[PDB]
Amino acid sequence: MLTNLVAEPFAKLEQDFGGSIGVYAMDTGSGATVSYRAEERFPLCSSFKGFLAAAVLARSQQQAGLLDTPIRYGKNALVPWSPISEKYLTTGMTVAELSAAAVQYSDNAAANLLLKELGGPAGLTAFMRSIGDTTFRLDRWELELNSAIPGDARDTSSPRAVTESLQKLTLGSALAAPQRQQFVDWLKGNTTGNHRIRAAVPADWAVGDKTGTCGVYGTANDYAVVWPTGRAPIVLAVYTRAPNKDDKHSEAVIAAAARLALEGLGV
Ligand SMILES: Nc1c(-c2nnn[nH]2)cnn1-c1ccc(Cl)cc1Cl
Ligand SMILES: Nc1c(-c2nnn[nH]2)cnn1-c1ccc(Cl)cc1Cl
Ligand SMILES: Nc1c(-c2nnn[nH]2)cnn1-c1ccc(Cl)cc1Cl
Numbered sequence: 001m002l003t004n005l006v007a008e009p010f011a012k013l014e015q016d017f018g019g020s021i022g023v024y025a026m027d028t029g030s031g032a033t034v035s036y037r038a039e040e041r042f043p044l045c046s047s048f049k050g051f052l053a054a055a056v057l058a059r060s061q062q063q064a065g066l067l068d069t070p071i072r073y074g075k076n077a078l079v080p081w082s083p084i085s086e087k088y089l090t091t092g093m094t095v096a097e098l099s100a101a102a103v104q105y106s107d108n109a110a111a112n113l114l115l116k117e118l119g120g121p122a123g124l125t126a127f128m129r130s131i132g133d134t135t136f137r138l139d140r141w142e143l144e145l146n147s148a149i150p151g152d153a154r155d156t157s158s159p160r161a162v163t164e165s166l167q168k169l170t171l172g173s174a175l176a177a178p179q180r181q182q183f184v185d186w187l188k189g190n191t192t193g194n195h196r197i198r199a200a201v202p203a204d205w206a207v208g209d210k211t212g213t214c215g216v217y218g219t220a221n222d223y224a225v226v227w228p229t230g231r232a233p234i235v236l237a238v239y240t241r242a243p244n245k246d247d248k249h250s251e252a253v254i255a256a257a258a259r260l261a262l263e264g265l266g267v
């Protein structure tokens, strides 16, 4: 199995990190998959925002005009790290702009505003159930969902479920064609992941990704769809945690895990 090829280097990497690393990667060309702690739960942190944007896009298939709807919000909506929605407080933003801000800058006010319109964490969880994801659960809002408490299943998923759902939404049939491409375009425009999966791929590959960084408990992550030039894409997810609250996350560890995953698939 391809999992067997990389089991020992993954174990070395997470011992060096001082925590747990979960990876799932699938080659959509061959069907090969690489697994390491891929069914364990890890905190989503801000990475839930990608699926949040997909849920909004799904809703736009039934509700015509949803994306262009202007949304006004008060200053009490501004949560720490709302760098985009901060700048449009006095003006408002459209639903599509909030979605792009949530994905591409991890804007917290934008994410909470969209979560509200979707019916809160249970509403996003329901969307994930509707595409066949039985693992994902969102329970809380920004920023409480980042507590990343050891053993706590709230606001978690697994690397395998994240990868399978990402595949359905970006490459499969879970979204209609125009919405699927919009989701991919938002992921391609992400600004926060240059040191994670993007650092593991060749310079000529196209990448769409979403990051998460709880910070506490050494907890951070990244998931991505990547396209080798002229080849079928790879979908992968890399999640980390660690036992102590003051343990530091590591972007280099995430990039290194992505490299091992790609090497295991034969790329
Ligand atoms: N804050 C600013 C300025 C700016 N220019 N003059 N004063 N401020 C320009 N770019 N940004 C910015 C930086 C980081 C992120 Cl995440 C989002 C934004 Cl909009
Ligand atoms: N862990 C949290 C919380 C939080 N509030 N309640 N429970 N957790 C809020 N911010 N952060 C945080 C800390 C460090 C880094 Cl690097 C990133 C993040 Cl988002
Ligand atoms: N660190 C992050 C992320 C993030 N998303 N993807 N990776 N990290 C999103 N929000 N925050 C954040 C939260 C609280 C404070 Cl006070 C400062 C920050 Cl910057």
Ligand SMILES: Nc1c(-c2nnn[nH]2)cnn1-c1ccc(Cl)cc1Cl
Pocket: 205, 206, 227, 228, 229, 230, 231, 232, 233
């Ligand atoms: N590699 C790409 C891209 C792409 N766009 N931007 N960068 N790469 C678009 N389509 N494909 C592709 C090529 C061959 C096969 Cl078999 C399957 C696919 Cl999906």
